[PDB]
A paper describes a structure:
Glutaminyl cyclases (QCs) from the oral pathogens Porphyromonas gingivalis, [name], and Prevotella intermedia represent attractive target enzymes for small-molecule inhibitor development, as their action is likely to stabilize essential periplasmic and outer membrane proteins by N-terminal pyroglutamination. Crystal structures of the enzymes from P. gingivalis (PgQC) and T. forsythia (TfQC) reveal a tertiary structure composed of an eight-stranded β-sheet surrounded by seven α-helices, typical of animal type II QCs. In each case, an active site Zn ion is tetrahedrally coordinated by conserved residues.
The same architecture is observed for TfQC, with an r.m.sd to PgQC of 1.1 Å for 286 Cα atoms.
Author numbering: 44 to 334
Write the structure that this text describes.
């Protein structure tokens, strides 16, 4: 079917228009209703995991993991996921005055949700043969900031850790999983992420092959990228479900992400419909080609 990059663009704009999706803010709460409501409008049976999660600083985060289960009676299922919270710190900003102030997270948060929001629209209009679980993970981007010296493990991906050990349905199972992260920036290039190739090799090939078949090899690069801490690591760990990350890899930065990453430059100004189009068209092709 047709992926509407313009609609996925408006869904990103709608989230960011709330203000930053920082856990324990009202903008976060209004956005939680908005995301779950849209999933339900497009035929999903919606599950909201409310969990009080502890950030690196000991703060209790009132998180919502949002699960849209499509055709929930189908036993053969694919997991599509992304994080929806916005980081509380622009801790890589060039202005130190912004280091403890939140980011809009248009690309880091908004893009991966927005694409999956249009997917929900498309699969309500043309039901796929397989079941689809759309999962929006909370409290992914609240990890220890650069301006804190002490290291603690697993302070990122707080929501995906909870769900992976506490699924929304008992014995939840997916054939494989596809994570979308920072999938809207102008000039994005998604290299094959190392954790993905390790545990989801057959599906990295599935996604990268389909992407080139559709003409999106300029986006899905046939080369290896970084080893990345992301939500797909904790779903792999917890369910042993093979998961891949479609995540921007920027080889020119020290961090490996776009220059706006964890800055207040992560706004709608960077979102590229053609980047959105590539990712959305590719995933729609693969899921409808699952039997
Ligand atoms: Zn982030």
């Amino acid at each position: 079917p047709t992926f509407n990059a313009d609609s996925a663009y408006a869904y990103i704009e709608r989230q960011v228009a709330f203000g930053p999706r920082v856990p324990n803010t009202e903008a976060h709460q209004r956005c939680a209703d908005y995301l779950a409501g849209e999933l339900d409008r497009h035929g999903a049976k919606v599950y909201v995991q409310e969990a009080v999660l502890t950030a690196y600083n000991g703060e209790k985060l009132k998180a919502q993991n949002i699960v849209g289960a499509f055709q929930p009676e189908k036993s053969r299922r694919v997991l599509l996921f992304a994080h929806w919270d916005s980081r509380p710190y622009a801790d890589h900003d060039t202005d130190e005055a912004n280091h403890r102030k939140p980011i809009d997270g248009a690309d880091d948060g908004g893009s991966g949700v927005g694409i999956l929001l249009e997917i929900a629209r498309q699969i309500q209009a043309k039901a796929p043969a397989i079941g689809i679980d759309i999962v929006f993970f909370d409290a992914e981007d609240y990890g220890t900031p650069e301006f804190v010296d002490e290291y603690k493990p697993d302070t990122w991906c707080l929501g995906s850790q909870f769900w992976a050990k506490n699924p929304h349905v008992p014995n939840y199972k997916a054939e494989f999983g596809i994570l979308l992260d920072m999938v809207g920036s102008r000039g994005a290039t998604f290299y094959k992420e190392s954790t993905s190739v390790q545990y989801a090799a057959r599906y990295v090939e599935k996604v990268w092959t389909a992407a080139r078949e559709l003409g999106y090899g300029k986006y899905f690069i046939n080369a290896q990228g970084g080893a990345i801490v992301d939500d797909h690591q904790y779903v792999i760990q917890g369910l042993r479900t093979p998961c891949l990350d479609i995540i921007n890899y920027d080889p020119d930065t020290q961090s490996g992400f776009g220059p706006y990453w964890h800055t207040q430059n992560d706004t709608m100004e960077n979102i590229d419909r053609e980047t959105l189009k590539a990712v959305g068209e590719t995933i729609l092709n693969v899921i409808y080609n699952e039997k």
